[PDB]
């Protein structure tokens, strides 16, 4: 529906969606920056039955950043909500981790916020 | 990926986390949370590194809950990114992030943040 | 120098700070949302010495939400980094902790992102 | 507010963190971090809730450091967010955000979160 199509951020990475009717997210993403090439898996959730006032519809989704051409042995995770109307938009805030050693663990985890607009027309 | 990732897990706060890992990467099973606007298991879904490096990290990995099943909605949803350590005392470390479904007023207080850790040792 | 001045984040917050010679920040905030109302002290610290490449200038402060006014027993501290130039810059992402229970603590910490920008004349 | 804050503790990682709590929200001190680009002590600066809840709510406080004193500049700065809690065993609960000075074209990978925990107890 409006979560479902083609998106990108303000990086140029692309974010192919497609929302299940139980609340399932399933797609690709494509990352225009970092130790990554080519297409990648998503999963994801997505709150299947929002409020009907203004609010947003609450989501997240993960990519594991391993596909047949790479390994950065990392995993991002993305988390917030979709809003809706003529410019749909897509408002999140991610959690990167790496696979670290014991001692390494500290430094393990990036924080950033990506915003996505849809196209797919 | 010797992935002993696979089973029951329990975090400080009690919550019960059951997880099947795929040879590919998925992640799948259900979760149940002692706190907050829940009761009884939501699915959730993630991936994982299948082919960790060969020295001694950890194994990234991270999976997503929407917080509505057949009993509750909380209209929110919480992923959780961090690193499996296998051993004598296997744990997953995590930190989270919960956003809730917000109108535009209230996006700027629609966030929290949080960190989790796993054993595999009742609450 | 760069930092010193009067800033505003994409919610209408003001924000005016001086920068010490020993990488010090002191000033007040003042948020346009939340409980809260008219000035708060706030106090930081910045990398007095950045890289003189095109790097931003590391910095962050922390502002307790308690006043004369009111006290929402909270503090916020930002982190992010100056860009300089002719639109100056500063790129933040921050922590919001409220005093709680211990039963109440999962949920005592949002995370956002601020913007701000340059004013002072 | 019987701010037990002002003293020495101690977090998971080894470092020391030593403050003084002004009468009106003021934290002052120095930081010395058992890991990363650093040596010896680093000036921080920060503010708490001086009027805490009369309820068992924790003290809200937080505080940064730039890190850079007169042995090494790692150009970065870090802020702790977080809550005191006073009683037989103190603790300081924190999450922190890393943000080190970057261009413009490596931002997205700039900020580092984690959390630490202080005690008043050794490393
Ligand atoms: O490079 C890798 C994999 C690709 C990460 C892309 C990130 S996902 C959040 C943001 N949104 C995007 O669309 N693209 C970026 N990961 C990685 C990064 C840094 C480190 N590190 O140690 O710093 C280790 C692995
Ligand atoms: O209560 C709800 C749904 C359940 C959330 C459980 C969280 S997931 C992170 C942490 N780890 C756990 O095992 N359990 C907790 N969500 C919710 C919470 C707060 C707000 N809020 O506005 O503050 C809105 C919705
Ligand atoms: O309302 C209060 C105090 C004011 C917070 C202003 C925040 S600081 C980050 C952001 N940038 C701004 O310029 N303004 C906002 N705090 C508070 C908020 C939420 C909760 N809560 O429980 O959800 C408790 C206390
Ligand atoms: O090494 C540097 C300076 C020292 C940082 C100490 C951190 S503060 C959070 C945590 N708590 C502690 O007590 N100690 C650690 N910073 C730095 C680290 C990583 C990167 N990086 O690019 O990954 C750049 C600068």
């Known amino acids: ?3 479902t199509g083609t998106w990108y ?4 990475s692309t974010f ?3 929302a299940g009717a139980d609340g399932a997210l399933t797609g690709t993403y494509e ?3 970092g130790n990554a090439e080519s297409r990648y898996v998503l999963t994801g959730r997505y709150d299947s039955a929002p409020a009907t ?3 947003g519809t609450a989501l997240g989704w993960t990519v594991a950043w391993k596909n047949n051409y790479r390994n ?6 993305w988390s917030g909500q979709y809003v809706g109307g003529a410019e749909a938009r897509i408002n999140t805030q991610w ?3 790496s696979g670290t050693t014991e001692a390494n ?4 985890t990036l924080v950033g916020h990506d915003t996505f607009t849809k196209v797919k027309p």
């Open 1 to 3: 529906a409006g979560i």
């Open 9 to 12: 951020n303000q990086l140029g």
């Open 16 to 18: 192919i969606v497609t």
């Open 31 to 33: 990352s225009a920056v």
């Open 53 to 55: 006032d203004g609010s």
């Open 72 to 77: 950065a042995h990392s995993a991002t995770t």
């Open 95 to 97: 959690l990167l981790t």
């Open 105 to 108: 663990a500290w430094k393990s």
